[PDB]
Amino acid sequence: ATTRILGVVQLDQRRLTDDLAVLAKSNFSSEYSDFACGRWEFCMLRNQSGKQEEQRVVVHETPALATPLGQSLPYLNELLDNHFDRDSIRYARIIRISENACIIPHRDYLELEGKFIRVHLVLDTNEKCSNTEENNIFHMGRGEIWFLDASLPHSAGCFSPTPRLHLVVDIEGTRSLEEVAINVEQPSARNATVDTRKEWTDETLESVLGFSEIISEANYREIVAILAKLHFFHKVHCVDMYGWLKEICRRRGEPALIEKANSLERFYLIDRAAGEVMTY
Ligand SMILES: O=C(O)CCC(=O)C(=O)O
Numbered sequence: 001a002t003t004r005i006l007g008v009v010q011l012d013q014r015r016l017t018d019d020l021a022v023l024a025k026s027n028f029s030s031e032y033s034d035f036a037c038g039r040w041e042f043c044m045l046r047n048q049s050g051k052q053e054e055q056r057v058v059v060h061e062t063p064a065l066a067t068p069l070g071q072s073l074p075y076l077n078e079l080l081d082n083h084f085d086r087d088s089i090r091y092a093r094i095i096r097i098s099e100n101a102c103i104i105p106h107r108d109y110l111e112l113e114g115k116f117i118r119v120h121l122v123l124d125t126n127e128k129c130s131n132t133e134e135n136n137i138f139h140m141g142r143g144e145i146w147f148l149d150a151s152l153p154h155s156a157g158c159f160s161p162t163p164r165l166h167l168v169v170d171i172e173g174t175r176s177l178e179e180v181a182i183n184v185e186q187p188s189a190r191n192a193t194v195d196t197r198k199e200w201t202d203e204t205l206e207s208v209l210g211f212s213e214i215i216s217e218a219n220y221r222e223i224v225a226i227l228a229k230l231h232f233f234h235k236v237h238c239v240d241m242y243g244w245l246k247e248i249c250r251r252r253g254e255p256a257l258i259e260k261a262n263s264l265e266r267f268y269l270i271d272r273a274a275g276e277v278m279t280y
């Protein structure tokens with residue numbers, strides 16, 4: 001299971017515009033804000049109970065049910081009906097990233113008894129929106145249905161004035177990946193997207209490690225966000241931010257900041273429990 005395009009669909013811009021206008025005014029969940037650097041957020045379209053109040057994810061066996069929000073988005077409802085198997089869906093969300101926001105580099109599923117198969121259908125995006133995986137950066141285009149191997153280190157950012165919205169579907173984890181996307185066109189091969197990021201250098205590295213002189217509890221959040229965003233513009237690994245933070249704090253020499261840095265990396269990449277939240 002490599003991250004890839006499963007298929008491509010035609011989006012109907014008129015009907016899409018209508019549902020996007022409703023989502024622009026919708027109440028988004030604050031759950032998993034511990035993963036957000038800025039305005040990375042989602043809302044529930046389908047979940048276990050069909051209730052708007054149910055906003056965290058667990059592995060379960062129920063064909064997901066449309067929430068009231070779900071029901072008020074009839075075109076997105078239709079897409080879900082037509083391009084996936086109903087009984088295989090466990091969640092469907094809209095995930096929006098607004099200007100200069102990202103989800104912090106992480107792996108998913110650590111707190112879950114099992115995994116999902118995570119699928120993105122891109123609704124509204126642009127050239128300044130990126131997803132990343134390990135050492136790579138790529139753009140998921142409008143109408144593309146992508147399988148995301150969320151068990152690998154990854155992130156996603158939006159660096160445009162305009163927000164980016166993806167329909168994200170969690171399919172029960174033992175399903176056959178080739179069977180997931182229904183009624184889709186096979187994508188043609190295309191030009192590889194070349195990685196336009198800057199080469200990482202000893203200068204850029206020393207500059208980052210220089211924050212050892214100023215890092216404190218008062219600016220920790222800002223520094224973490226800056227570090228998280230670097231791999232969208234420099235050729236470095238998703239996870240390198242955590243090594244940088246650890247070395248920044250080792251040089252600073254304050255025990256509290258070193259412990260936090262260890263916990264940060266651990267929570268996002270190594271180990272966390274069900275319902276556990278990372279406040280930093
Ligand atoms: O593209 C996004 O907003 C989120 C990417 C991600 O971390 C996920 O879907 O697991």
Ligand code: PRO
Nearest residue numbers: 032035057106108109
């Ligand atoms: O798996 C999930 O849905 C949450 C959201 C991002 C981090 N983990």
Ligand SMILES: [Co+2]
Nearest residue numbers: 107108150154
């Ligand atoms: Co993820």
